[PDB]
């Protein structure tokens, strides 16, 4: 169970295979990200590791319902 997040940026395959095309909503797990502004990003079937901008994963609401009032 690895941090899951979740692509608040769409993320177009620019140059892929090292990189981890996302869309606006989808949901990957993050395995490490750099301070160069790439996350690793690996499929959440643990398919495909690949990288993707950082700013680009927000952390996804698994395990987490929070109700307000």
Do not use: H, Q
């Not at 692509?7 to 295979?17: E, I, L, Q, V």
């Not at 495909?48 to 996804?60: D, R």
């Amino acid at each position: 169970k690895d941090p899951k997040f979740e692509a608040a940026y769409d993320f177009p395959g620019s140059g892929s295979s090292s990189e981890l095309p996302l869309k606006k909503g989808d949901i990957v797990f993050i395995s490490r990200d750099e301070p160069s502004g790439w996350s690793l990003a690996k499929l959440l079937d643990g398919s495909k590791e690949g990288w993707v901008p950082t700013a680009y994963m927000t952390p996804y609401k698994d395990t987490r319902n929070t109700v307000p009032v």
